[PDB]
Write an enzyme that holds these catalytic residues in place. Structure first.
Site, PDB file in Angstrom:
ATOM      1  N   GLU A  17       0.799  -1.032   0.058  1.00  0.00           N
ATOM      2  CA  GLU A  17       0.010   0.072   0.052  1.00  0.00           C
ATOM      3  C   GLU A  17       0.931   1.320  -0.001  1.00  0.00           C
ATOM      4  O   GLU A  17       0.762   2.029  -0.735  1.00  0.00           O
ATOM      5  CB  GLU A  17      -0.926   0.000   1.038  1.00  0.00           C
ATOM      6  CG  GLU A  17      -1.947  -1.109   1.169  1.00  0.00           C
ATOM      7  CD  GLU A  17      -2.886  -1.362   2.392  1.00  0.00           C
ATOM      8  OE1 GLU A  17      -2.369  -0.590   3.343  1.00  0.00           O
ATOM      9  OE2 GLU A  17      -3.726  -1.711   2.434  1.00  0.00           O
ATOM     10  N   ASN A  50      -0.190   6.329  12.138  1.00  0.00           N
ATOM     11  CA  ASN A  50       0.655   5.336  12.360  1.00  0.00           C
ATOM     12  C   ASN A  50       2.173   5.690  12.501  1.00  0.00           C
ATOM     13  O   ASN A  50       2.995   5.128  12.976  1.00  0.00           O
ATOM     14  CB  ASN A  50       0.526   4.274  11.072  1.00  0.00           C
ATOM     15  CG  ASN A  50      -0.779   3.198  11.181  1.00  0.00           C
ATOM     16  OD1 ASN A  50      -1.433   3.395  12.234  1.00  0.00           O
ATOM     17  ND2 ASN A  50      -1.255   2.824  10.084  1.00  0.00           N
ATOM     18  N   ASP A 134      -0.390  -5.078  17.245  1.00  0.00           N
ATOM     19  CA  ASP A 134      -0.486  -5.852  15.979  1.00  0.00           C
ATOM     20  C   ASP A 134       0.558  -6.907  15.911  1.00  0.00           C
ATOM     21  O   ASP A 134       1.337  -6.908  14.944  1.00  0.00           O
ATOM     22  CB  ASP A 134      -0.209  -4.696  14.905  1.00  0.00           C
ATOM     23  CG  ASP A 134      -0.807  -5.013  13.581  1.00  0.00           C
ATOM     24  OD1 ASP A 134      -1.515  -5.876  13.527  1.00  0.00           O
ATOM     25  OD2 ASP A 134      -0.567  -4.511  12.519  1.00  0.00           O
TER      26      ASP A 134
END
Ligand code: 96M
Ligand code: CL
Ligand code: CL
Length: 261
Positions: A17, A50, A134
Site C-alpha cells: 500500500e 501510524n 499488531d
C-alpha cells in the site's frame, strides 16, 4: 538526497500500500539496514498517525534485543524514510511460507523459543506502559547466524493509560478489543502471540470471522499437526482464555519453566 548520500540500495525486500522496503548498506559504517521509503502521509490521515505512533513509540522505548531497532526517520522530497535494523532471516510469516514450500517445520523446542523471545519483547514494551496491538507473524522478524526473534512495526503502538486503538488483523484479534473494551490491552498482545505461535506450528490458516473465529475466542486452540507436549499445549491454550485476566502477563510468561527449559 540524504537517502542516496548515506546509503547504497541493495535490493527491495518489501512493498505494499506504501511504500517499499530496501536492504541498504550505510556507507559510513558498512552495516546493513532496512529502510522503508514511502510517500509522505497526507496530514491527518491514518497513515500519518501510524507513522506518529511509530516515532513516538521509539522515543519511549529506545533499544531492546527483541524489538527491531529504529535508528532514524526523516522526510525529504515528499517522501518519508524510516531506517531500521536489518533482520537477515526475514519475517516469521516468510519463514512459515518457506516451511510449507520445502516441507520443513519448527521443532517444539524452537516454538517455545519463539514464544519466550517475543514474550521478552512484550515484557519490555508493557513495562513502559505501551502495548503493541499488531502482533502477528508478518511483524515478527528473525536475525540468524543461533536465532533472535524481534518485534517489528510499532505503527499501532498505543498507551495503556490513554489507548487509541487501531485494530489489527482480525485473525489475531482478541474478542474484548473488538468489543471496544480497552482495559486489559496487554492481554490482547498475549492472545495474538499465542495464535502467532499456533500459526508457526503448522495450524490451518486462521479464520477472519464466522464460527471458527468465535470458537477460538471461546478458548479453543486450533488443531496443531505436530505433537506438542501437553504442558506446552496447555500454556498456549491459557494464553487465549476468554477471560483476559486468566491470560498470563508477559512477565509471567518469560518466567515460565516450560519455556526456559
Ligand atoms: C531475501 C529475499 N526475499 C524473499 C523472502 C525478499 C524479502 O526477504 C526479506 C529479508 C529480510 C527482511 N528483513 C527485514 N528486516 C527489518 C525490516 C524492517 C521493516 C520496517 C518496519 Cl516493520 C517498520 C518501519 C520501518 C521498517 Cl524498515 C520492514 O518493513 N521489513 C520488511 C524489514 N525486513 C525482510 C524480507
Ligand atoms: Cl518515487
Ligand atoms: Cl503481572
Amino acid at each position: 538526497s540524504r537517502y542516496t548520500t548515506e546509503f547504497h540500495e541493495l535490493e527491495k525486500i518489501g512493498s505494499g500500500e506504501f511504500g517499499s522496503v530496501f536492504k541498504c548498506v550505510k556507507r559510513l559504517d558498512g552495516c546493513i539496514y532496512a529502510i522503508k521509503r514511502s510517500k509522505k502521509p497526507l496530514a491527518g490521515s491514518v497513515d500519518e498517525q501510524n507513522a506518529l505512533r511509530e516515532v513516538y513509540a521509539h522515543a519511549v522505548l529506545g533499544q531492546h534485543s527483541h524489538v527491531v531497532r529504529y535508528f532514524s526517520a526523516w522526510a525529504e522530497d515528499d517522501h518519508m524514510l524510516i531506517q531500521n535494523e536489518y533482520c537477515n532471516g526475514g519475517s516469521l510469516a516468510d519463514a512459515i511460507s518457506e516451511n510449507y514450500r520445502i516441507m520443513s517445520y519448527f521443532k517444539e523446542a524452537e516454538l517455545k523459543d519463539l514464544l519466550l523471545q517475543v514474550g521478552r519483547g512484550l515484557r519490555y514494551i508493557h513495562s513502559m506502559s505501551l502495548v503493541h496491538m499488531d502482533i502477528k507473524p508478518s511483524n515478527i522478524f528473525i536475525s540468524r547466524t543461533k536465532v533472535m526473534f524481534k518485534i517489528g512495526d510499532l505503527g499501532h503502538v498505543t498507551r495503556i493509560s490513554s489507548p487509541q486503538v487501531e485494530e489489527g488483523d482480525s485473525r489475531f484479534l482478541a474478542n474484548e478489543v473488538l468489543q471496544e473494551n480497552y482495559t486489559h490491552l496487554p492481554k490482547a498482545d498475549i492472545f495474538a502471540l499465542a495464535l502467532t505461535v499456533v500459526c508457526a506450528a503448522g495450524a490451518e490458516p486462521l479464520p477472519r470471522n464466522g464460527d471458527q473465529w468465535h470458537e477460538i475466542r471461546q478458548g479453543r486452540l486450533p488443531r496443531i499437526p505436530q505433537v506438542l507436549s501437553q504442558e506446552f499445549t496447555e500454556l498456549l491454550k491459557v494464553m487465549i482464555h476468554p477471560d483476559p485476566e486468566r491470560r498470563p502477563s508477559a512477565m509471567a510468561l518469560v518466567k515460565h519453566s516450560v519455556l526456559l527449559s
